[PDB]
Amino acid sequence: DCHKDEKGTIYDYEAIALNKNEYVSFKQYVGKHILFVNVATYCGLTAQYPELNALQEELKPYGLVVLGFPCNQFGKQEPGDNKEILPGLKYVRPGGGFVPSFQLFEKGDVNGEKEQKVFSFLKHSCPHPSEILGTFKSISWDPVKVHDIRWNFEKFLVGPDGIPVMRWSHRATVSSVKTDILAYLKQF
Amino acid sequence: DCHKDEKGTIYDYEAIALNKNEYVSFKQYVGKHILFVNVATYCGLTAQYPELNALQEELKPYGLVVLGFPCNQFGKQEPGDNKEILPGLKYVRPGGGFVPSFQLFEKGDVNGEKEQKVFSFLKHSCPHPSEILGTFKSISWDPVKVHDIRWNFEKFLVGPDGIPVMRWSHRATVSSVKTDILAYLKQF
Amino acid sequence: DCHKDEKGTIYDYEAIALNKNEYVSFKQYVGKHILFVNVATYCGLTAQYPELNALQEELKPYGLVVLGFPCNQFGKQEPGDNKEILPGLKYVRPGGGFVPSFQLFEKGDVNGEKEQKVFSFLKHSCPHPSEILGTFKSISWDPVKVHDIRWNFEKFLVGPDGIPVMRWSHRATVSSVKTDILAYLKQF
Amino acid sequence: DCHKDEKGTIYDYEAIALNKNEYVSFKQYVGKHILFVNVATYCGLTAQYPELNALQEELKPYGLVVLGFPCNQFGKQEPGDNKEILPGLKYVRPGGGFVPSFQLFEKGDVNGEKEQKVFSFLKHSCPHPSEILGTFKSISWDPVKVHDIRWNFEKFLVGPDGIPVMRWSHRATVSSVKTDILAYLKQF
Numbered sequence: 001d002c003h004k005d006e007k008g009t010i011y012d013y014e015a016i017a018l019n020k021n022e023y024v025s026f027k028q029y030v031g032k033h034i035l036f037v038n039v040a041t042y043c044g045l046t047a048q049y050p051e052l053n054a055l056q057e058e059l060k061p062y063g064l065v066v067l068g069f070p071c072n073q074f075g076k077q078e079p080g081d082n083k084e085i086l087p088g089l090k091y092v093r094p095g096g097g098f099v100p101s102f103q104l105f106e107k108g109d110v111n112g113e114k115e116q117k118v119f120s121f122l123k124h125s126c127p128h129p130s131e132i133l134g135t136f137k138s139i140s141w142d143p144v145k146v147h148d149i150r151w152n153f154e155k156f157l158v159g160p161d162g163i164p165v166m167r168w169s170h171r172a173t174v175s176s177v178k179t180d181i182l183a184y185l186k187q188f
Numbered sequence: 189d190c191h192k193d194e195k196g197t198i199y200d201y202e203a204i205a206l207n208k209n210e211y212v213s214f215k216q217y218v219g220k221h222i223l224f225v226n227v228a229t230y231c232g233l234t235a236q237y238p239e240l241n242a243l244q245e246e247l248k249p250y251g252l253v254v255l256g257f258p259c260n261q262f263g264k265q266e267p268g269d270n271k272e273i274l275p276g277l278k279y280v281r282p283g284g285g286f287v288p289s290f291q292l293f294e295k296g297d298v299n300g301e302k303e304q305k306v307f308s309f310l311k312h313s314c315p316h317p318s319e320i321l322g323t324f325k326s327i328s329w330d331p332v333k334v335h336d337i338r339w340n341f342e343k344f345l346v347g348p349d350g351i352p353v354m355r356w357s358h359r360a361t362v363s364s365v366k367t368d369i370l371a372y373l374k375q376f
Numbered sequence: 377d378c379h380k381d382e383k384g385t386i387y388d389y390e391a392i393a394l395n396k397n398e399y400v401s402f403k404q405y406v407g408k409h410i411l412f413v414n415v416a417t418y419c420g421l422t423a424q425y426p427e428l429n430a431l432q433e434e435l436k437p438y439g440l441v442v443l444g445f446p447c448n449q450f451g452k453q454e455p456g457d458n459k460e461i462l463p464g465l466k467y468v469r470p471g472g473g474f475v476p477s478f479q480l481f482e483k484g485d486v487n488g489e490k491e492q493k494v495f496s497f498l499k500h501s502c503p504h505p506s507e508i509l510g511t512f513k514s515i516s517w518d519p520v521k522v523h524d525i526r527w528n529f530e531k532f533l534v535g536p537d538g539i540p541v542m543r544w545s546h547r548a549t550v551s552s553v554k555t556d557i558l559a560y561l562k563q564f
Numbered sequence: 565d566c567h568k569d570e571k572g573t574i575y576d577y578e579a580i581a582l583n584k585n586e587y588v589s590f591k592q593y594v595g596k597h598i599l600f601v602n603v604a605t606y607c608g609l610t611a612q613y614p615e616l617n618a619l620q621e622e623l624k625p626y627g628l629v630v631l632g633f634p635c636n637q638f639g640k641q642e643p644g645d646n647k648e649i650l651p652g653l654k655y656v657r658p659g660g661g662f663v664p665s666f667q668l669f670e671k672g673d674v675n676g677e678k679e680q681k682v683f684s685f686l687k688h689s690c691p692h693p694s695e696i697l698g699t700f701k702s703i704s705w706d707p708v709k710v711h712d713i714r715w716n717f718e719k720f721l722v723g724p725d726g727i728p729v730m731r732w733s734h735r736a737t738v739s740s741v742k743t744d745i746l747a748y749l750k751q752f
Contacts, residue, residue, distance in 0.1 A: 042644065077643060079605075079643060080606065088655075088656050092652050133333060144322045144324065146319050264455070267417075272471075275467050275471065276467075276468050509709060509710055510707065512704075512706035512708065515700070520697045520703060521695045522695050523695060
């Protein structure tokens with residue numbers, strides 16, 4: 001008689017926090033602007049972790065939540081088991097006692113057949129800005145799709161309604177990401 | 189004082205015919221609808237060669253020109269030197285005396301760093317219809333870009349003004365390509 | 377009470393001829409010196425086919441039998457289905473009407489998990505002379521073993537008792553192989 | 565008039581210690597039995613580090629010196645810069661405060677074109693016991709040679725005269741290595 005179209009949002013997904021052993025529904029983050037970052041410990045970009053802490057500190061009052069997703073698909077730069085990831089950040093790289101000031105989740109794929117379902121959603125929702133997907137070397141997964149994540153520390157912004165709004169290359173500095181987010185927050 | 193914007197077309201490029209040893213400017217094909225196909229001898233799709241002959245026969249009077257570009261990047265399915273390609277089609281696959289009834293050019297890359305410049309133009313001018321770029325296996329070139337050719341026997345249509353109009357997956361039968369071209373030709 | 381040790385020879389194996397559709401037991405070749413060559417159509421070494429014909433002609437009276445085994449594992453240089461291999465040699469490479477004057481068999485693996493059992497025997501029976509197994513590029517099979525065949529047109533000699541005697545690199549000219557075989561035949 | 569043949573030993577080589585920033589000639593180890601191990605932090609075998617400490621403790625009085633060589637060629641399981649390797653062992657894996665009780669050196673290749681010269685010597689001096697070199701996956705270097713190291717935690721014993729004596733697969737437990745070394749030490 002009547003068809004009601006049911007629409008997809010970020011709140012349809014969930015993941016296991018690294019530091020508890022407990023599932024976190026993204027419904028927790030209703031009304032918040034969510035920054036999803038795929039992370040790794042042994043990347044040149046790992047140096048930006050304290051910049052991510054600073055971003056989160058600065059913009060928490062504006063309703064920004066940063067979420068970090070370890071992934072070993074990009075140069076095999078997250079080799080650690082889940083229990084090893086936080087100790088590696090604290091004592092190896094960045095080292096110096098570093099602890100993320102935002103929520104990290106269990107390690108998993110962001111591309112290919114076993115990719116996490118939230119990343120399918122994010123990737124299908126927002127195109128990557130570059131025509132470059134990779135080098136012969138960098139692509140390690142199967143199948144390969146035009147909206148795949150290119151590398152460690154790629155980023156997605158999800159609005160306060162759970163619909164993805166924006167995506168940055170891993171090549172964009174955290175400072176430029178902040179500047180972009182600050183200009184986006186002026187709407188609200 | 190004044191800037192005149194100079195615009196790119198298919199007529200800006202050229203290639204060496206396989207059967208002469210002579211360069212052919214695509215200016216030759218002014219006012220014609222051009223079907224570019226990347227070809228190979230040892231692909232399952234090689235079976236469609238007689239369908240391409242038939243397409244060309246059927247639509248020559250309507251101003252269609254088919255152009256075939258051997259390429260060894262997709263499963264290494266065009267291993268032959270330029271002199272070996274036509275004998276291979278005639279005597280191996282399809283065999284049976286098969287001769288293409290359209291112009292083939294010298295073998296070269298259609299993707300990656302040494303890709304032919306006409307294929308850069310075509311690929312940048314018309315998106316591929318699928319989000320799937322490949323398998324881990326199928327991608328053999330560097331760098332990898334979202335508008336790369338996926339496989340043997342992918343196809344592009346260029347209008348009578350030299351601007352690319354349409355692109356088909358290698359998965360589309362020559363019959364469906366014909367049907368699509370016949371519907372496009374109704375405008376003229 | 378008593379154990380009798382049963383010993384392995386070339387006569388324990390068989391393969392399907394390319395040009396019949398019939399199995400050939402290597403027992404046929406009892407009392408003969410057998411030269412096994414893995415072959416391909418689109419290799420630089422394919423040029424040596426007429427040298428193999430000449431070798432076979434010259435040494436048939438001395439009891440030499442040459443056997444050719446198409447294989448697609450080395451640069452994917454034997455892409456043809458079994459029915460396409462002889463036409464490819466005649467009309468493509470070497471071309472010119474070339475027909476092998478020795479027996480070719482159906483195409484199959486010589487290395488890795490699906491290798492032909494006769495090649496396991498040969499490889500395990502006679503070491504390769506070089507410490508070099510390959511480049512990162514050349515090795516295409518799994519698993520990888522120290523006595524694997526390195527490339528197209530590697531060669532093994534089996535004595536008149538079915539025990540392998542000698543193995544040549546693909547880098548050895550057919551002339552040097554002949555010279556070596558002629559010196560070996562002086563024992564008999 | 566006269567040629568004197570000059571012979572190669574372990575004392576012809578040197579490497580940079582991880583924990584100093586200083587070169588160590590293997591001449592230091594004259595008259596000692598040297599156990600060379602290629603090591604990594606993120607391997608299943610990394611668990612054997614305390615077994616290596618125990619081996620070294622136990623057999624130091626018998627003149628055994630263990631030497632550890634970080635290498636990132638086997639599953640990319642040593643991603644850390646030189647400064648990160650000891651902190652990773654102490655705080656990540658094995659973790660728990662683990663410090664090696666034997667000398668580790670700077671990270672480098674043990675196979676392929678940029679392999680360390682001491683490993684060329686060792687590998688050329690003592691064959692590996694298995695015919696298996698790898699999987700398609702495990703081999704990451706170029707060129708590939710039959711005496712290459714197969715994986716993390718492969719081992720070589722060098723006698724008190726600097727000539728290599730023995731080599732173990734990475735598949736051999738440290739307990740069996742100890743048992744073998746104890747039986748070898750009975751000669752002296």
